[PDB]
Amino acid sequence: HMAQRAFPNPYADYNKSLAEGYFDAAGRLTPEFSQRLTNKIRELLQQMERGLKSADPRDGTGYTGWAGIAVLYLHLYDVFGDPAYLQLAHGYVKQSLNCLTKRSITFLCGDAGPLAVAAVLYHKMNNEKQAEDCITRLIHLNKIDPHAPNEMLYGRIGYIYALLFVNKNFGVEKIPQSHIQQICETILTSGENLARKRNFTAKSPLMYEWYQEYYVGAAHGLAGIYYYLMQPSLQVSQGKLHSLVKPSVDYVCQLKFPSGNYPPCIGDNRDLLVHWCHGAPGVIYMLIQAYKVFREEKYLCDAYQCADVIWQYGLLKKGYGLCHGSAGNAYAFLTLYNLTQDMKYLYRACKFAEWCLEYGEHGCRTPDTPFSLFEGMAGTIYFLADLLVPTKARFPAFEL
Ligand SMILES: N[C@@H](CCC(=O)N[C@@H](CS)C(=O)NCC(=O)O)C(=O)O
Ligand SMILES: [Zn+2]
Numbered sequence: 001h002m003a004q005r006a007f008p009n010p011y012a013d014y015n016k017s018l019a020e021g022y023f024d025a026a027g028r029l030t031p032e033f034s035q036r037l038t039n040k041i042r043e044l045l046q047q048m049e050r051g052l053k054s055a056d057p058r059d060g061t062g063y064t065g066w067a068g069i070a071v072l073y074l075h076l077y078d079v080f081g082d083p084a085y086l087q088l089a090h091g092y093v094k095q096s097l098n099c100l101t102k103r104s105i106t107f108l109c110g111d112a113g114p115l116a117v118a119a120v121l122y123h124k125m126n127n128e129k130q131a132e133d134c135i136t137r138l139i140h141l142n143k144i145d146p147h148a149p150n151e152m153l154y155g156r157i158g159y160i161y162a163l164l165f166v167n168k169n170f171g172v173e174k175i176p177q178s179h180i181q182q183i184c185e186t187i188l189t190s191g192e193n194l195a196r197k198r199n200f201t202a203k204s205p206l207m208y209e210w211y212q213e214y215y216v217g218a219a220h221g222l223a224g225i226y227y228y229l230m231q232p233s234l235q236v237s238q239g240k241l242h243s244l245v246k247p248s249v250d251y252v253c254q255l256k257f258p259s260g261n262y263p264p265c266i267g268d269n270r271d272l273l274v275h276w277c278h279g280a281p282g283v284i285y286m287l288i289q290a291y292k293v294f295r296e297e298k299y300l301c302d303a304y305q306c307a308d309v310i311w312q313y314g315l316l317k318k319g320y321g322l323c324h325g326s327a328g329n330a331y332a333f334l335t336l337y338n339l340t341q342d343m344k345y346l347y348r349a350c351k352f353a354e355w356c357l358e359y360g361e362h363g364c365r366t367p368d369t370p371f372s373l374f375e376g377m378a379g380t381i382y383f384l385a386d387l388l389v390p391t392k393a394r395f396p397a398f399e400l
Contacts, residue, residue: 060099
């Protein structure tokens, strides 16, 4: 059913000859291809700026609203060094800070996005008072909540991301490790408890759910949570890594469809969605991190299969977005490239970029938020700009 959701891939797979137009033998993009990316970035930014005039004033979130546009501009400032991008970021930060709803804790869908992004923006503009005030508020956002989910968009790991985002950008431990540690403990305890209650323990020592479903993928599910639990920056003990996390990862691996794709939820039979939010483009991060941490070939094998699924069925009719679109899917190639150093995957990313350079010429659906970071144009632009230096590229608001 995957074929129904994708355009046929018109591109030939990697060879040295075809790759030479995109990058040199060291994987550095050609000046020509770099400039083509740059030209499209500039073109799309104009469209995005105009389109955002019609966006909902109330939505300040990273996923669909103002803080996500600020994320893009902070990134463009880092990539290009144009002070105008930092100024644009400031404007969007200011909008986002007028939109706090006090309903959610996450970087993507909650108040942590505006606060963390503002902290970084103010820091980059040498505004210590405002930066520090934002950090204080971010730290305070963490309330005791036994019913809070564990996943990326609305749960504990999404709050953790905001903390990591501040620390990374300040280059110092602004938020004490102990804050992250306490949340990590809660996540692990929650997982063990649910697995015990449902008698998953034997096959999976941890289990998580969101809206009463066992989601598998990056956005709402197991792959996102385990990706985080395996991250050195969360400092999960070797004991818990091996006794709890690894067998839980292995359980997810065993859910793989024959195609190499993954079900949205445990028990789902229809092999349909090839998205970051649901399916191989999101699960790949868990597999790659598991390979890095455990060094078992099976994880790398599965990652290759993800890349092949995405190469065949990853050019989505949904559009060019990050959450569920061609640009988000292209990041899967970059993560595998950055692990393997295999230029085949850099090439695949470049070809997906080629597709995005024909933005709007394919008959894709218009997203609900056509200009947002996760549904719309801002995310596509983010990807194009990130591709300029492939080794540093990271799926935004998610990848560490
Ligand atoms: N609001 C989205 C459309 C909804 C959507 O695609 N949702 C994702 C999850 S975030 C999905 O996988 N939907 C199920 C499907 O495609 O069947 C947009 O405008 O891009
Ligand atoms: Zn999605």
